[PDB]
Design a protein around this ligand. Structure first.
Ligand code: NAP
Ligand code: 48I
Length: 316
């Protein structure tokens, strides 16, 4: 189990990163500092998480402390939906760079395929309760992303929450300059993503698994929803290995040649979650975890389902 995976820009990406969605500004500096200390090099960020400044402070601290150097870190951020217009993309990237306090990003993703009305509000809604879209399209937004590579702001570009047809649209774009390096998608034992993973990997696109613990802290969760972390079948596998359920849920995608980005703001759990390089799930464990798929996704909004580019109408 090598700790990094080769990307199609020639760079190497650490397979275990720290998620930062819902880590509040007042606590995330400590979280990221602890993460870097215990071995995390990959940090998953986004402008919409509204904590990039404080992630950036942790990075600056660890550089100053001589704990890491910039080139050892793999910092990912994402273009929010309200900035899909070609003319807004560079400024959005620069804002993220200013907040993270970096010269460049290792990877910059189109966060969702759906463009939203530009403006101050991140989730502009109309009187029907649906998001107000923008007059933007995947291919033009991709071209703007490509310019960021040529301008040296980012080392690689990729996508997130794109279905296979949306990926294909980019792969077949006339005059394509860069293929997506990564597609970051929800993936865990209840949403194993076998078809989309098969598709992306065959194209040399690395898949990052988000919400690997089932995002129990998501806001819009339903009392009548699942709980991976409490699934006794998964705890049974953990117990066999003298590990925790979270550790099993993190190791699982690692053994599928995926990158994985579990989130914690808690020092003890940040450290726990990185202790997954000293054991292996058996081939039976792997097959068994795959059998738990129920095609249940937690990251999707009713308010986005009428968007022309909503990704989850398609099977995969
Ligand atoms: N591209 C996208 O559209 C997208 C969407 C969703 C997520 N993501 C990325 O993926 C990351 C991970 O997904 P996520 O934040 O949805 O959820 P997750 O990583 O599946 O779960 C995080 C939750 O699990 C808890 N937890 C973490 N480690 C634990 C442990 N060892 N034992 C018990 N509980 C533990 C955390 O609590 P504490 O923090 O309180 O310790 C938090 O409540 C995000 O932070 C974000 O970076 C991207
Ligand atoms: O985007 C993230 O990384 C985390 N996050 C944050 C807010 C949110 O509404 N959602 C759900 C969301 C956001 C945008 C969209 Cl465009 C959709 N959707 O269903 O199409 C869902 C999130 O997944």
């Amino acid at each position: 189990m090598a700790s990094r995976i080769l990307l199609n820009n020639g760079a190497k990406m650490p397979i275990l990163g720290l998620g930062t969605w819902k880590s509040p500004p007042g606590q995330v500096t400590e979280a990221v500092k602890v993460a870097i200390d215990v071995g995390y090099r990959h940090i998953d960020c986004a402008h919409v998480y509204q904590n990039e400044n404080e992630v950036g402070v942790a990075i600056q601290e660890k550089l100053r402390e001589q704990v890491v150097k910039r080139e050892e870190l793999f910092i990912v951020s994402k273009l929010w939906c309200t900035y899909h217009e070609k003319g807004l993309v560079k400024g959005a990237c620069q804002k993220t760079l200013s907040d993270l306090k970096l010269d460049y990003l290792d990877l910059y993703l189109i966060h969702w395929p759906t463009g939203f009305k530009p403006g101050k509000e991140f989730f502009p809604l109309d009187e029907s309760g649906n998001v107000v879209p923008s007059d933007t399209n995947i291919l033009d937004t991709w071209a703007a992303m490509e310019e960021l590579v040529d301008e040296g702001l980012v080392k690689a570009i990729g996508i997130s929450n794109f279905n296979h047809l949306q990926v294909e649209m980019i792969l077949n774009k006339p005059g394509l300059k860069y293929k997506p390096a990564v597609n970051q998608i929800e993936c865990h034992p209840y949403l194993t993503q076998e078809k989309l993973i098969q598709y992306c990997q065959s194209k040399g696109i690395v898949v990052t698994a988000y919400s690997p613990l089932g995002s129990p802290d998501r806001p819009w969760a339903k009392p009548e929803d699942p709980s991976l972390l409490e699934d006794p079948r998964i705890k049974a596998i953990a117990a066999k290995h003298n590990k925790t359920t979270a550790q099993v849920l993190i190791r699982f995608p690692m053994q599928r040649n995926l990158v994985v980005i579990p989130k914690s703001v808690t020092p003890e759990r940040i450290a726990e979650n990185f202790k997954v390089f000293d054991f292996e799930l058996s081939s039976q464990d792997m097959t068994t975890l795959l059998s738990y798929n129920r095609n249940w996704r937690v990251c999707a909004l009713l308010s986005c389902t009428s968007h022309k580019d909503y990704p989850f109408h398609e099977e995969f």
